[PDB]
Paper text:
Assembly of ribosomes requires the transcription, folding, modification, and processing of ribosomal RNA (rRNA), and stable association of ribosomal proteins (RPs) facilitated by trans-acting assembly factors (AFs). The crystal structure of mature yeast ribosomes first revealed that the eukaryotic NPET is composed of rRNA from five out of six domains of 25S rRNA, and the RPs uL4 (rpL4), uL22 (rpL17), and eL39 (rpL39). In eukaryotes, the bilobal tunnel domain (TD) at the tip of the uL4 internal loop forms two constriction sites as opposed to one found in bacteria. We found that pre-60S particles lacking the TD of uL4 harbor a misassembled NPET that lacked the densities of eL39 and the Nog1 CTD and are blocked or stalled in at least three different stages of 60S subunit assembly.
The R1 and R2 particles (27% and 12%, respectively) closely resemble Nog2 state 1 particles, containing a prerotated 5S RNP, and thus have progressed beyond the stages represented by the R3 and R4 particles. In classes R1 and R2, no density could be observed for the NPET-occupying RP eL39, the Nog1 CTD, or AF Arx1 that binds to the NPET exit platform. Although class R2 exhibits wild-type rRNA conformations, significant shifts in rRNA helices 68–69 and 74–79 could be seen in class R1. Further analysis of the atomic model of class R1 revealed how a misassembled NPET could cause these rRNA conformational changes. These aberrant shifts begin with a loss of the interaction between the TD of uL4, the Nog1 CTD, and the linker between rRNA helices 73 and 74. H74 is displaced ~4 Å relative to the wild-type conformation, indicating that this portion the NPET is improperly assembled. The conformational change of H74 affects the adjacent H75, which can be seen shifted up to ~33 Å from its native position in Nog2 state 1. In this aberrant position, H75 clashes with H68 and displaces it up to ~62 Å toward the 5S rRNA. Specifically, the L1 stalk (H76 and uL1) adopts an unusual, deflected conformation not observed in any previously characterized wild-type particles and H79 is unstructured. Class R2 particles are wild-type-like and likely progress to class R1 particles, which display a shifted rRNA helix H68 (gold) that prevents binding of Sda1 and progression to Nog2 state 2.
Residue numbers in the entry:
A (entry chain V): 3 to 137
B (entry chain B): 2 to 97
C (entry chain b): 2 to 448
D (entry chain r): 2 to 74, 85 to 96, 117 to 261
E (entry chain m): 140 to 182, 185 to 472
F (entry chain y): 1 to 244
Write the structure that this text describes.
RNA sequence: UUCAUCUAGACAGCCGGACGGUGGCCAUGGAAGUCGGAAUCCGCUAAGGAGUGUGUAACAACUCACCGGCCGAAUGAACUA
RNA sequence: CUCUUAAGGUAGCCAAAUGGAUUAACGAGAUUCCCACUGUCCCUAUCUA
RNA sequence: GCAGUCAAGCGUUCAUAGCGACAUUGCUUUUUGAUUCUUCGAUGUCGGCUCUUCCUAUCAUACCGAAGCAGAAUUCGGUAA
């Protein structure tokens, strides 16, 4: 894991490969298509899967024409699959969403719309600098 | 032919035979080693399992990301009235 | 660019053979019987051929993609490597390896097609051996190029990382003038310091900061008079350094007795290398002046020394390696002279200042009102000492308590004990926060 | 970095405290370890070891004899010095090849029961303007990857071989039918173009075609090797 | 030259004077840097490497017909055929030309004849076709064709030339002629119009014919058709193979990114008459207008983009929108 | 008075810390190296407090205040609210606000006298800000950049805005805030200038890669070391030309 | 088994000598026996190469090839089974 | 040797609207893709006769 | 592979009647890392799921040896399934 601040606890995976999420940043893309998962396991028949606060590789299925045909890194900031916090309570958002980044963890856009999980803003210091709403 | 794809085994071959036990009360197979420079004490007890319940505790763990935070967890309560002593046994040590 | 140190390795022919031909005997099956089907007997040996072909091709690719392609890099490194490794031989050996890479591939391609028509284990085995033998015989002819390239690789991994576009001052002259001593004085680099002519045979680099900027200083082996055709491959490094590098050259002069060369030769050397000073803004320096003080020089030698100041522009100074405090003035003046040209040249662009008018220009308030908004500093800070990281008595620096108690991930800091109550006794207390239902904090208030 | 830094460092501090004695004792243990390795190292690491152990001995004998001899102890022009470099055939009575090998039965039909076709499994010289036959009237297949075009022809004297194209298959032993088909087995007599050797006959003409004999089985390699007939 | 013996001290070849040394180096530095300036604008990927993003893997449907299963039929047809005819597309012949094998046939098989046939000649004007025959008839014969069974053009010219080729080889008992070219140029349709019945299968989809097939006519001349080749040129596009109809457009993934090419190749006046039209710019709007008119609406209620772009590309390749490439001007 | 340190290994000092005129808050995770990097420069002059906001280490982008008060978001628990009230003296009002834009450090960019706010922040919070911090309030972007609190550093001495800011916007913002401004960078060319350093009247701290030409401008514009009176950029002109 | 050394003293060890023309010529920034090239001679001796290795920027220094001193009886090489 | 490339700038002269077979409709014929939809799958668990 | 050169031994003694290890030259296309747009007839069967176990001829993990191995990253080897 390169670019992340510290260790990461385990939360429920809710987005296998082939899933499509939205683009919360204002770079110009409108959605994203997961095709790999940075830092996964390896097991026969298992689909690589991502969870909140993870770094994935994606293409752009719809959006600005300069941003397509290229695979880029993204970070997942909203999950819509109930996970469990340690101040015991389960929760989930209203949709899956992520933002496009660079292999160090820095953002392309300038602002992020809608809530952002603590479990991602605490991991990536530059998402906590561009998010205006946390949780 | 060589399976074309390596994958771990299914199950653990040390917990075999997978047969029913021989009593409702499992037996202790080893005890703490010893030290004759210490007071006499028991090494185990006997209780009865009674359900689970939830807990929150104020965590101290230098280094953890939950140092100085609360965590909710599950616990098991077992019911242990006192135990009464009714006999003593002695064991000789033979080359068998 | 800039210091290719990651060239993988090159083994000689007799060990390249062994590496590849044992890889193909360890990482491919070995047992085959004649009772098996003929398609199996064919496949076995086709594999034995293809694998060794890929082995040799891959050993050659890492050489063809690692070396720095002497043509079209930068006409400074090009000429340096030319004087260092003989550009002709350099290109020839790599073309030899590139040619072997195609020959091997064609052999591998042909003998597979031949194998797919074999009719017995004997004939197929013989074709396998024929192919591997022709490969080995192609390789065994590279005994000389593969031996030259390893030394070139080793020696090019150790070259200094000079940069042509940056801010450079060159230090040249005769043997034994004081140039390496001056580089040692300014920068901090390991340079053999003994008194003879060629104690150095390469260029040496050092760096130093001036006016919040970074500069490099280069130290050259030195030139003789040697009328321009009977010159070593040692003088060529100095000459190409002077010719290719936008810099400031500090010509030293040993107007002295220790190696007190004939001044009528040193000035002739200066005048002979003078064409290299097209736009370099030279600055002659007289070194080892703690025993001469050139004020006491003869009239005709004064005329020799005046014969230099009739060039376009050359400033004169005087210093020594003993009184190492006036020597900073030399490098400060030379840096000023370099920046003089740098800044006017960069202003000449006249589109860079338009876009950097954002970072060199402050914006004033116009003050909009009379309300007083003054900076606020308390007195507990104006009364403060300064933490000296070495003094026997200082502040306690909580990390010291941590490291002494202690440890990084084993010390438990008491979060209380550092705050202010009406009674310092009851600070290690516990707030209840819950009753029957009834959050306590919801009812808790004064009055 | 940047120069011979390890050498400078050795000149300046120097190599170790226990360096020379370590090396001096490795040297002395070498004679024990070499003999211990000759009795271990099973399985092709004994063969690889013994072969070099033998080559080194031979080289030492060569060096010693040369040194020992160093104690006591054809009419070329000025421009050619200072530089460098019966009617029987050599191969009569080669082994015989039956018709069961060198031919290969090829069966046709959806249920393959109509063979009538034969593929040659040796090398051939097909000619100049080949033009394969229709698949329906084709009966003697000669695949396109066994077709040869050149040969490695060597002069008996003159110690040199050249890569010369072929011009015909004059005569193949063990059958005339194979001579017709153009087969290139061992012992075959072929006609090669020898303009690269620059031969001139009495009367001043220029030879450009002669006979050679093939001297290998070119089904166990690719090359066709031949010796000129002079 | 170099090493622990290194019996070389002075360079090559002792340049004549510093006066010209400084000149040569001062020219070479500028010469160097201007090249880098030019290549910067030409094309870069360093910023892609910084932003850490890369390019998607190229699709496999753009790799036919390479793949030796068909290049093993090509050399077999060339081996068996006495005379070869190379078929071109009258819309753009220089792209479907496939030189790349004429060098072969010239080097290894000079006794084979290799004429040109330029068919699909009813999709271009008459002056265009005449100009193309003229400009191509300075290398090979190059006849001009139009292959239908009932209404053809050129059948007699091809027949009475195969008869000449057969008379020349009057001691060979038969001659074979083989048809080669790109996919979807009409190799099978030419055989069908020559013989005047449906002998070999034809279809608008590229990869129709898969193996070679013998067909007799006149008892002394056979015709052989084979699958269509695309030489593996390691350059020149991924989107040129599309517009020289080779790929089955059903398999390309995002077919809307290719429509700017259609707008560039064709004419606005022609494109306005086949759909029919509204006025537009920025081909995204072209597609939106067209789909709204034609009712290609998705599940409520927005238009379909890919489903319409596929049929636009199919209309382009199958001869429903008029277009052609200008022939080389006179001289 | 410019210092260079790090959190665990990150250069974003303003994410894990918050420095005002009278106190300082620092994160909890791992060891007492970051806290000691502040104690080395401030000793016992002002309170330094180990804290979390909502159980997270990012306590710079979630709080907001000056020497008068301190605002926390609505996710802050009662335990940490009480911890802050215990550790800070009685001269500093504390308040938990209930605003949707719950990253108050990203949303507000305040000093002792004036504050810039995100243009969509609402009325109750706009009134609480002026009430507790005793400041003025301006809805305003920074070259069309929402989240003023992270793309700008502020002090009583001067400010610093991200290098894409236009000169006209600089002049206007200077008119508003009554302090000089420049457009620079931090941590070897980063555009989040407010989230990568913490500054006040008499101390500035920034990451371990803030180069010398950046540390110069930071030391000048905030008038840190006596004396750097915001005109020495006249001696800093040539180095800036050569480094830009 | 076949050849050699040997009480006019062997093999293994210690200690001493290891010289003069001469830093022999051509090379070149420097090459003095030891980065290279062509010879490889002369004098004086008991013996001592225009030099077997380590070493220096060049030298110096150590070393064996070859001699002698101390001790005292067997030793070495090649080869076959 | 009795002998062979005419044609010119985004749609051409002619010929009874048309220049067609690139043929509508139909289909327990064969085939490729898209939207929707899902335990096909990640990865299985539970219920009734 | 074919055609030679060499030269320790073997061969009844033997060179030269003969063999003959190890070394070595001839060439299969172009001396300047230029793209080589071969991709040319398998006559008979591979290819892929579910699941065990064995070999080592080791990819990674553990321990070592050598390299211009400064640090970082590598390369070649040893034990080891
Ligand atoms: N006493 C004294 N000697 C000096 C002084 N400066 C130079 N030297 C002499 O310089 C000798 C060493 O050479 P350097 O100073 O490196 O000059 P250099 O030989 O030309 O330098 P390089 O060619 O790069 O190796 C010393 O032995 C000194 O005798 C000085 O200031 N005082
Ligand atoms: N407009 C026009 N279309 C033609 C002409 N000739 C053929 N076509 C069309 O082009 C396509 C040709 O298909 P094929 O004849 O199979 O061409 P091919 O792909 O080279 O032939 P195969 O070897 O069978 O693959 C058919 O759809 C025809 O309708 C023509 O002269 N004019
Ligand atoms: Mg020196
Ligand atoms: Mg086709």
């Amino acid at each position: 894991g390169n670019g992340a601040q510290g260790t990461k606890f385990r939360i429920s995976l809710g987005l296998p490969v082939g899933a499509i999420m939205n683009c919360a940043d204002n770079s110009g893309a409108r959605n994203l298509y997961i095709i790999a998962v940075k830092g996964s396991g390896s097991r026969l028949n298992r689909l690589p899967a991502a969870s909140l606060g993870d770094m994935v590789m994606a293409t752009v299925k719809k959006g600005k024409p300069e941003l397509r045909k290229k695979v880029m890194p993204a970070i997942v900031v909203r999950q819509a699959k109930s996970w469990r916090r340690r101040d015991g309570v389960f929760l989930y958002f209203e949709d899956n969403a992520g933002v496009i980044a660079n292999p160090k963890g820095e953002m392309k856009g300038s602002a992020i719309t809608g809530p952002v999980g603590k479990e991602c803003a605490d991991l990536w210091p530059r998402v906590a600098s561009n998010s205006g709403v946390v949780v | 032919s060589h399976r074309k794809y390596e994958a771990p085994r299914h199950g653990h071959l040390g917990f075999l035979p997978r047969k029913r036990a021989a009593s409702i009360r499992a037996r202790v197979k080893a005890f703490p080693k010893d030290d004759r420079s210490k007071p006499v004490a028991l090494t185990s007890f006997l209780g009865y399992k009674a359900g689970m319940t939830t807990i929150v505790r104020d965590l101290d763990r230098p280094g953890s990301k939950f140092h100085k935070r609360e965590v909710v967890e599950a616990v098991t309560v077992v019911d242990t009235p006192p135990v009464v002593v009714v006999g003593v046994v002695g064991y000789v040590e033979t080359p068998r | 660019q800039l210091s290719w140190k990651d060239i993988p390795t090159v083994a000689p022919a007799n060990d390249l053979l062994d590496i590849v031909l044992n890889r193909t005997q360890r990482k491919t099956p070995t047992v085959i019987r004649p009772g098996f089907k003929i398609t199996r007997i064919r496949a076995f040996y086709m594999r034995k051929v293809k694998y060794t072909g890929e082995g040799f091709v891959e050993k050659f690719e890492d050489i063809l993609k690692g070396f720095p392609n002497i043509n079209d890099v930068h006409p400074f490194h090009r000429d340096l490597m030319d004087t260092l490794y003989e550009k002709n031989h350099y290109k020839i050996s790599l073309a030899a390896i590139s040619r072997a890479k195609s020959l091997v591939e064609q052999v591998a391609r042909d003998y597979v097609r031949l194998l797919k028509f074999g009719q017995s284990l004997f004939q197929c085995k013989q074709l396998k051996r024929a192919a591997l033998g022709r490969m080995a015989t192609i390789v065994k002819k590279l005994r000389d190029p593969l031996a030259y390239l390893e030394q070139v690789r080793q020696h090019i991994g150790r070259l200094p990382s000079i940069d042509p576009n940056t801010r450079t001052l060159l230090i040249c002259g005769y043997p034994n003038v004081g140039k390496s001593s001056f580089l040692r004085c300014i920068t901090k680099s390991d340079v053999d310091v003994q008194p003879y002519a060629f104690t150095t045979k390469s260029l040496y680099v050092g760096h130093f900061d001036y006016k919040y900027l970074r500069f490099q200083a280069i130290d050259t082996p030195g030139i003789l008079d040697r009328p321009t055709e009977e010159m070593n491959n040692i003088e060529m490094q100095s000459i190409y350094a002077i010719a290719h590098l936008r810099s400031c050259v500090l010509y030293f002069m040993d107007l002295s007795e220790q190696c007190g060369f004939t001044i009528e030769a040193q000035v002739k050397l200066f005048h002979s290398i003078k064409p290299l000073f097209a736009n370099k803004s030279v600055m002659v320096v007289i070194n080892k002046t703690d025993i001469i003080r050139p004020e006491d020089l003869d009239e005709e030698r004064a005329q020799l020394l005046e014969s230099v100041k009739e060039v376009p522009g050359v400033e004169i100074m005087t210093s020594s390696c003993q009184l190492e405090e006036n020597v900073m003035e030399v490098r400060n003046k030379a840096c000023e002279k370099l920046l003089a040209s740098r800044i006017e040249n960069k202003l000449k662009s006249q589109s860079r200042i338009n876009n950097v008018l954002n970072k060199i220009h402050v914006a004033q308030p116009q003050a909009r009102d009379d309300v007083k908004r003054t900076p606020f500093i308390p007195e507990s800070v104006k009364n403060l000492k300064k933490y000296d990281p070495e003094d026997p008595n200082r502040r306690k620096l909580a990390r010291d308590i941590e490291a002494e108690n202690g440890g990084a991930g084993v010390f438990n800091v008491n979060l209380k004990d550092k705050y202010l109550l009406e009674d310092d006794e009851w600070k290690n207390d516990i707030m209840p926060e819950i009753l029957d239902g009834k959050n306590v904090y919801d009812f808790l208030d004064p009055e | 970095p940047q120069n011979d830094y390890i050498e400078r460092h050795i000149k300046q501090h120097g190599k170790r405290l226990d360096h020379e004695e370590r090396k001096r004792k490795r040297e002395a243990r070498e004679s024990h370890k070499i003999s211990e390795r000759a009795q271990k190292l099973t399985g092709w690491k004994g063969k690889q070891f013994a072969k070099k152990r033998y080559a080194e001995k031979v080289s030492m004998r060569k060096k010693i004899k040369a040194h020992e001899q160093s104690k006591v102890k054809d009419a070329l022009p000025t421009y050619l010095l200072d530089r460098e470099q019966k009617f029987s055939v050599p191969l009569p009575k080669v082994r015989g090849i039956s018709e069961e090998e060198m031919f290969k039965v090829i069966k046709t039909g959806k249920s393959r029961s109509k063979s009538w076709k034969r593929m040659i499994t040796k090398h051939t010289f097909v000619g100049e303007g080949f033009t394969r036959r229709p698949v329906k009237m084709e009966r003697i297949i000669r695949p396109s990857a066994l077709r040869q075009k050149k040969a490695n022809v060597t002069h008996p004297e003159l110690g040199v071989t050249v890569f010369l194209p072929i011009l015909a298959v004059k005569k193949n032993p063990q059958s005339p039918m194979y001579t017709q088909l153009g087969v290139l087995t061992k012992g075959t007599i072929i006609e090669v173009n020898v303009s690269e050797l620059g031969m001139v006959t009495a009367g001043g003409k220029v030879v450009w075609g002669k006979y050679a004999q093939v001297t290998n089985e070119p089904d166990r390699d690719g090359c066709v090797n031949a010796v000129l007939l002079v | 030259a170099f090493g622990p013996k290194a019996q070389r001290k002075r360079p090559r070849l002792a340049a004549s004077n510093l006066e010209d040394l400084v000149k040569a180096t001062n020219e070479d530095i500028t010469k160097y840097e201007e090249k880098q300036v030019l290549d910067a604008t030409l094309g870069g990927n360093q910023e892609d490497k910084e932003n850490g993003w890369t390019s998607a893997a190229k699709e496999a449907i753009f790799s036919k017909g390479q793949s030796k299963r068909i290049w093993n039929e090509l050399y077999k047809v060339i081996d068996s055929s006495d005379v070869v005819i190379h078929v071109l597309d009258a819309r753009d012949p220089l792209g479907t030309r496939c030189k790349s094998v004429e060098e072969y046939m010239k080097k290894e098989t000079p006794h084979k004849h290799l004429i040109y046939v330029l068919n699909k000649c009813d999709l271009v004007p008459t002056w265009v076709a005449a100009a193309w025959v003229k400009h191509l008839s300075k290398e090979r014969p190059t006849l001009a064709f139009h292959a239908s069974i009932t209404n053809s053009f050129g059948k007699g010219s091809l027949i009475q030339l195969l008869r000449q080729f057969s008379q020349l080889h009057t001691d060979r008992k038969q001659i074979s002629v083989g048809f080669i070219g790109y996919p979807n140029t009409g190799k099978s349709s030419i055989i069908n119009t020559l013989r005047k019945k449906k002998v070999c299968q034809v279809a608008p989809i590229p990869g129709e014919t898969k193996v070679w097939q013998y067909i007799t006519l006149m008892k002394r001349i056979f015709l052989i058709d084979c699958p269509g080749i695309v030489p593996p040129s390691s350059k020149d596009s991924e989107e040129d193979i599309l517009f020289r109809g080779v790929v089955r457009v059903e398999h390309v993934t995002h077919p809307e990114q290719y429509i700017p090419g259609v707008l560039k190749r064709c004419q606005v006046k022609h494109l306005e008459r086949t759909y029919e039209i509204s006025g537009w710019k920025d081909a995204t709007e072209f597609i939106e207008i067209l789909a709204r008119k034609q009712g290609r609406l998705l599940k409520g209620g927005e238009p379909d983009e890919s489903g319409v772009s596929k049929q636009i590309l199919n209309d382009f390749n199958r001869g429903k929108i008029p277009w052609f490439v200008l022939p080389p001007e006179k001289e | 008075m410019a210092t260079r340190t790090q959190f665990e290994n990150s250069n974003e000092i303003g994410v894990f810390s918050k420095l005002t005129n009278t106190y300082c808050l620092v994160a909890v995770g791992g060891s007492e190296n970051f806290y000691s990097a502040f104690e080395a420069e401030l000793g016992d002059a002002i309170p330094i407090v180990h804290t979390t906001i909502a159980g997270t280490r990012i306590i710079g982008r979630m709080t907001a205040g000056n020497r008068r008060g301190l605002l926390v978001p609505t996710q802050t628990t009662d335990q940490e609210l009480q911890h802050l009230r215990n550790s800070l003296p009685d001269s500093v009002k504390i308040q938990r606000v209930e605003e949707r834009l719950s990253a108050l450090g990203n949303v507000i960019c305040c000093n002792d006298y004036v504050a810039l706010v995100h243009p969509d922040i609402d009325r109750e919070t706009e009134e609480l800000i002026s009430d507790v911090l005793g400041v003025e309030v301006f809805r305003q972007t920074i070259s069309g950049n929402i989240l003023v609190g992270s793309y700008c550093s502020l002090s009583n001495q001067g400010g610093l805005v991200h290098p894409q800011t236009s000169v006209q916007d600089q002049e206007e913002l200077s008119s508003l805030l009554q302090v000089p401004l420049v457009a620079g960078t931090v941590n070897r060319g980063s555009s989040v200038v407010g989230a990568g350093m913490v500054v006040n009247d008499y101390l500035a701290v920034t990451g371990l890669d803030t180069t010398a030409p950046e540390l110069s401008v930071i030391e000048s514009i905030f008038r840190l070391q006596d004396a750097q009176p915001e005109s020495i950029s006249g001696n800093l002109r040539d180095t800036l030309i050569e480094t830009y």
